[PDB]
Write an enzyme that holds these catalytic residues in place. Structure first.
Site, PDB file in Angstrom:
ATOM      1  N   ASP A  43     129.633  51.508  70.450  1.00 36.56           N
ATOM      2  CA  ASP A  43     130.431  52.612  71.222  1.00 36.56           C
ATOM      3  C   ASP A  43     130.026  54.293  71.299  1.00 36.56           C
ATOM      4  O   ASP A  43     130.088  55.169  70.427  1.00 36.56           O
ATOM      5  CB  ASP A  43     131.769  52.628  70.005  1.00 36.56           C
ATOM      6  CG  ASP A  43     132.941  53.293  70.244  1.00 36.56           C
ATOM      7  OD1 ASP A  43     133.575  52.890  71.261  1.00 36.56           O
ATOM      8  OD2 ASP A  43     132.824  54.422  69.911  1.00 36.56           O
TER       9      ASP A  43
ATOM     10  N   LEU B 287     142.125  66.537  58.648  1.00 34.09           N
ATOM     11  CA  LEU B 287     141.424  67.203  60.483  1.00 34.09           C
ATOM     12  C   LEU B 287     142.102  65.566  60.638  1.00 34.09           C
ATOM     13  O   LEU B 287     142.473  66.420  61.909  1.00 34.09           O
ATOM     14  CB  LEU B 287     140.098  66.604  60.019  1.00 34.09           C
ATOM     15  CG  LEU B 287     139.404  67.335  58.898  1.00 34.09           C
ATOM     16  CD1 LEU B 287     137.872  66.596  58.671  1.00 34.09           C
ATOM     17  CD2 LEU B 287     139.071  68.787  60.097  1.00 34.09           C
ATOM     18  N   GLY B 288     142.539  64.665  59.835  1.00 32.01           N
ATOM     19  CA  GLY B 288     143.505  63.592  61.215  1.00 32.01           C
ATOM     20  C   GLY B 288     143.778  62.418  60.935  1.00 32.01           C
ATOM     21  O   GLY B 288     143.247  61.962  59.343  1.00 32.01           O
TER      22      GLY B 288
ATOM     23  N   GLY C 209     142.404  57.662  62.960  1.00 28.11           N
ATOM     24  CA  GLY C 209     142.433  57.178  63.249  1.00 28.11           C
ATOM     25  C   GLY C 209     142.997  55.591  62.815  1.00 28.11           C
ATOM     26  O   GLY C 209     143.095  55.700  61.938  1.00 28.11           O
ATOM     27  N   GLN C 210     142.691  54.365  63.523  1.00 29.75           N
ATOM     28  CA  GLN C 210     143.793  53.927  63.727  1.00 29.75           C
ATOM     29  C   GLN C 210     143.345  52.615  62.252  1.00 29.75           C
ATOM     30  O   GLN C 210     143.639  51.894  61.613  1.00 29.75           O
ATOM     31  CB  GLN C 210     143.914  52.467  65.026  1.00 29.75           C
ATOM     32  CG  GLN C 210     144.234  53.429  66.064  1.00 29.75           C
ATOM     33  CD  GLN C 210     145.908  53.264  65.798  1.00 29.75           C
ATOM     34  OE1 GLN C 210     146.360  53.106  65.400  1.00 29.75           O
ATOM     35  NE2 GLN C 210     146.526  54.608  66.134  1.00 29.75           N
ATOM     36  N   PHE C 211     142.256  53.030  61.514  1.00 27.96           N
ATOM     37  CA  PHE C 211     141.605  52.493  60.465  1.00 27.96           C
ATOM     38  C   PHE C 211     141.279  53.811  59.716  1.00 27.96           C
ATOM     39  O   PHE C 211     140.868  53.134  58.302  1.00 27.96           O
ATOM     40  CB  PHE C 211     140.122  51.437  60.990  1.00 27.96           C
ATOM     41  CG  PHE C 211     140.929  50.116  61.399  1.00 27.96           C
ATOM     42  CD1 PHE C 211     142.189  50.202  60.122  1.00 27.96           C
ATOM     43  CD2 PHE C 211     140.580  49.784  62.321  1.00 27.96           C
ATOM     44  CE1 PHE C 211     142.604  48.603  60.070  1.00 27.96           C
ATOM     45  CE2 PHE C 211     140.740  48.224  62.233  1.00 27.96           C
ATOM     46  CZ  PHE C 211     142.179  47.296  61.428  1.00 27.96           C
ATOM     47  N   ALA C 212     141.663  54.642  59.536  1.00 31.16           N
ATOM     48  CA  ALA C 212     141.054  55.763  58.271  1.00 31.16           C
ATOM     49  C   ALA C 212     142.306  56.975  58.837  1.00 31.16           C
ATOM     50  O   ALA C 212     142.710  57.723  60.173  1.00 31.16           O
ATOM     51  CB  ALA C 212     139.816  56.331  58.957  1.00 31.16           C
ATOM     52  N   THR C 213     141.699  57.739  57.093  1.00 34.63           N
ATOM     53  CA  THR C 213     142.677  58.989  57.128  1.00 34.63           C
ATOM     54  C   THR C 213     141.398  60.151  57.146  1.00 34.63           C
ATOM     55  O   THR C 213     140.538  59.808  56.385  1.00 34.63           O
ATOM     56  CB  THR C 213     143.413  59.122  56.480  1.00 34.63           C
ATOM     57  OG1 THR C 213     143.049  58.916  55.631  1.00 34.63           O
ATOM     58  CG2 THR C 213     145.108  58.486  56.815  1.00 34.63           C
ATOM     59  N   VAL C 214     141.591  61.606  57.874  1.00 30.70           N
ATOM     60  CA  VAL C 214     139.653  61.918  57.572  1.00 30.70           C
ATOM     61  C   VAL C 214     140.514  63.065  56.993  1.00 30.70           C
ATOM     62  O   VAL C 214     141.319  63.697  57.746  1.00 30.70           O
ATOM     63  CB  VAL C 214     139.331  62.097  59.273  1.00 30.70           C
ATOM     64  CG1 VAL C 214     137.876  62.889  58.394  1.00 30.70           C
ATOM     65  CG2 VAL C 214     138.282  60.663  59.193  1.00 30.70           C
TER      66      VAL C 214
END
Ligand SMILES: Nc1ncnc2c1ncn2[C@@H]1O[C@H](COP(=O)(O)OP(=O)(O)OP(O)(O)=S)[C@@H](O)[C@H]1O
Ligand SMILES: [Mg+2]
EC number: 2.7.11.22
Lengths: 65, 281, 298
Positions: free
Chosen positions: C123, C9-10, C12-17
């Site tokens: 946020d 899926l992709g 984020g600057q602190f995760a891989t989904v």
């Protein structure tokens, strides 16, 4: 198929907490530290502290496992 | 909010018997795990000795969170002690040493609560050499995920302090019979510490713990506050609810009454036997 | 061991989904692995875990599971095909007033639950409003979300995406209430009505200039006691564009909702509850059922 607002009945097992607006004219806010003018410039009103303290005080009293 | 929390749903048990069942199950699981892998060695700890060591290391956890060089807020200390209580509710002291889990619970409480403390500071709060501080940090980081797994990823702990303050506000507001409820504040702080020493955090809601502290302080100071229960809480009509609350409060007061603090010789012997159990794994 | 990866899926600057499927319920989930010094588990992941473990609403994302291995963890949420940003930016699919009302209703119901639980989604933006094929909007990520009740806690003023930041956060309010979420919700509604970011700022000063030139600088009878914030700077007195000129095709009730969500005074700003009680949501065009909401196909 219109929408009617329902007040989100979440059942707290405890005594009733008065509403946030009907909270300074019941006398509670006299016994909470007044919010500083800077704090009041944001969304803080010193009744949020009172309301949170009262909601945690009455959250579970009429409940045991 | 507590009434929706995972603390109410999972970590709030019906009796001390269920707590003893859980701890004896954890002790038996460790014992059987040790036996089945290469059968009654006296090196093992008993569940009550494990409870003694847990009481001792919870005392040391209070001592550490009290001398923490940045002033640790009391919600953080309550959260750390609750984590200690739960972790050793479902895990055996001989598997994971309570000093490392003590520090790990403090670490995770500092992080889950928003008491922002850097790891070098946190290990600087340890009365060990910088080498010892580095090794203690290594162990804390090793055990942090284990602690979070053993909590079933339920990291929000509800402490009796905010319900204590809310009861004090409501008591100054709707209970004019009582004047100056802050004498109650001092004595209820004492009783709240006492009750945090016991296993009442797993058995009663934080609201009930706070109300018991307050009414116990009143009873010690000679104030009667049955009008605050029957009236001003509208327990005058649901009599069964009033008697239920009174039973909860009496049960928890007695629970603080029967608490016996860990000894000095017994804790020494238990620490030595535990370190012998940990050295010989 | 229990979940099989299906798609990348992709990040984020602190995760891989990764999209995934569990071998126990053949339900499609989204697993979120967190990356990795000498601090331990990342605090954004712990904040996700701790806040989403004690929330259960239709319109808030729920982590169906959480686990991990040496020094790293993986959360398991409902799989959400899209977010509101891809719905906004996709020029093909139209957003009728009923669709806008549905998105607003789901957003404000989720946020009303979250605010009754004294949690503040600090946020809120169309990127962080996911929604499944059933068209159920869920508040996406809680990696910067807090509990706003306690006085003794000193918050931070820098935490919300700049474009969806309230004026008081730009002025440096270290203490705030639900007004930050409600301002971001007003900005989401404005972007939902215009399909382009309302008030896109290049900096905090530029964001404030655009807020003030679009709505008028507050006059201290509209936002009394404003001058006390730590980073307050006086601004040229902009007139502000009338709301029935910014949103030239919004009803009067919708205009009242916009005005409430865009009040400068963070205490006069309407809350999720009283926003939900306004005539906008009860008027004739009902919100669309989640089945009839448009989905961006590919
Ligand atoms: N529940 C979910 N279901 C499906 N996809 C998801 C879900 N949550 C996140 N994603 C996707 O995973 C991507 C990365 O996760 P994020 O939630 O964006 O983490 P992030 O740290 O917020 O990313 P940044 O910092 O904004 S780049 C998102 O852009 C989505 O495309
Ligand atoms: Mg992202």
């Amino acid at each position: 198929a219109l929408y009617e607002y329902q007040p989100l009945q979440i059942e707290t097992y405890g005594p009733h907490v008065p509403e946030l607006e009907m909270l300074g004219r019941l006398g509670y806010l006299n016994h909470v530290r007044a919010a500083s003018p800077q704090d009041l410039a944001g969304g803080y009103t010193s009744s949020l502290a009172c309301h949170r303290a009262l909601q945690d005080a009455f959250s579970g009293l009429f409940w045991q496992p | 909010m507590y009434h929706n929390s995972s603390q109410k749903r999972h970590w709030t048990f019906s009796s001390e018997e269920q707590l003893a069942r859980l701890r004896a199950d954890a002790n038996r699981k460790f014992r059987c795990k040790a036996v089945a892998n290469g059968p009654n060695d006296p090196v093992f700890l008993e569940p009550h000795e494990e409870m003694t060591l847990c009481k001792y290391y919870e005392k040391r956890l209070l001592e550490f969170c009290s001398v923490f060089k940045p002033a640790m807020p009391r919600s953080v200390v309550g959260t750390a002690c609750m984590y200690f209580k739960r972790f050793y509710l479902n895990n055996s002291v001989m598997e994971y040493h309570p000093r490392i889990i003590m520090l790990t619970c403090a670490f995770l409480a500092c992080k889950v609560d928003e008491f922002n403390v850097s790891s070098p500071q946190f290990v600087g709060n340890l009365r060990e050499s910088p080498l010892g501080q580095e090794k203690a940090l290594e162990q804390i980081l090793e055990y942090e995920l284990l602690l979070i797994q053993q909590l079933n990823f339920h990291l929000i702990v509800h402490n009796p302090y905010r319900p204590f303050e809310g009861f004090l506000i409501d008591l100054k507001t709707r209970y004019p019979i009582l004047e100056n409820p802050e004498i109650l504040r001092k004595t209820a702080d004492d009783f709240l510490n006492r009750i945090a020493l016991t296993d009442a955090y797993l058995l009663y809601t934080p609201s009930q713990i706070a109300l018991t502290a307050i009414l116990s302080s009143a009873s010690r100071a000679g104030i009667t506050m049955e009008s605050y229960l029957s009236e001003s809480l509208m327990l005058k009509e649901n009599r069964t609810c009033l008697s239920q609350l009174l039973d909860i409060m009496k049960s928890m007061r007695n629970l603080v009454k029967k608490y016996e603090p860990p000894r000095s010789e017994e804790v020494a012997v238990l620490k030595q036997k535990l370190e012998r159990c940990h050295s010989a794994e | 061991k229990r979940y099989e990866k299906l798609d990348f899926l992709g990040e984020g600057q602190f995760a891989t989904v990764y999209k995934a499927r569990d071998k126990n319920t053949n339900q499609i989930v989204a697993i979120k692995k967190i990356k990795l010094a000498k601090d331990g588990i990342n605090r954004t992941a712990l904040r996700e875990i701790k806040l989403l473990q004690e929330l259960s609403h239709p319109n808030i994302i729920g982590l169906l599971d959480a686990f991990g291995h040496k020094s790293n963890i993986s959360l398991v949420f409902d799989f959400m095909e899209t977010d509101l940003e891809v719905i906004i930016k996709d020029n093909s699919l139209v957003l009728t007033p009923s669709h806008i009302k549905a998105y607003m209703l789901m957003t404000l119901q989720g946020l009303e639950y979250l605010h009754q639980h004294w949690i503040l989604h600090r946020d809120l933006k169309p990127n962080n409003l996911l929604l499944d094929e059933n068209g159920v909007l869920k508040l996406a990520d809680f990696g910067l979300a807090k509990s706003f009740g306690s006085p003794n806690r000193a918050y931070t003023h820098q935490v919300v995406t700049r474009w969806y930041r309230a004026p008081e956060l730009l002025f440096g309010a270290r203490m705030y209430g639900v007004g930050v979420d409600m301002w971001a919700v007003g900005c989401i509604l404005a972007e939902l009505l215009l399909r382009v970011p309302f008030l896109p700022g290049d900096s905090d000063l530029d964001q404030l200039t655009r807020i003030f030139e679009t709505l008028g600088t507050p006059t201290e009878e509209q936002w009394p006691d404003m001058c006390s914030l730590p980073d307050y700077v006086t601004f040229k007195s902009f007139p502000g564009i009338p709301l029935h000129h910014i949103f030239s095709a919004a009803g009067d009730d919708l205009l009242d909702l916009i005005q409430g969500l865009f009040l400068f005074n963070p205490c006069a700003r309407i809350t999720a509850t009283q926003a939900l009680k306004m005539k906008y949501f009860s008027n004739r065009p009902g919100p669309t059922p989640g089945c009839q909401l448009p989905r961006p196909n590919c």
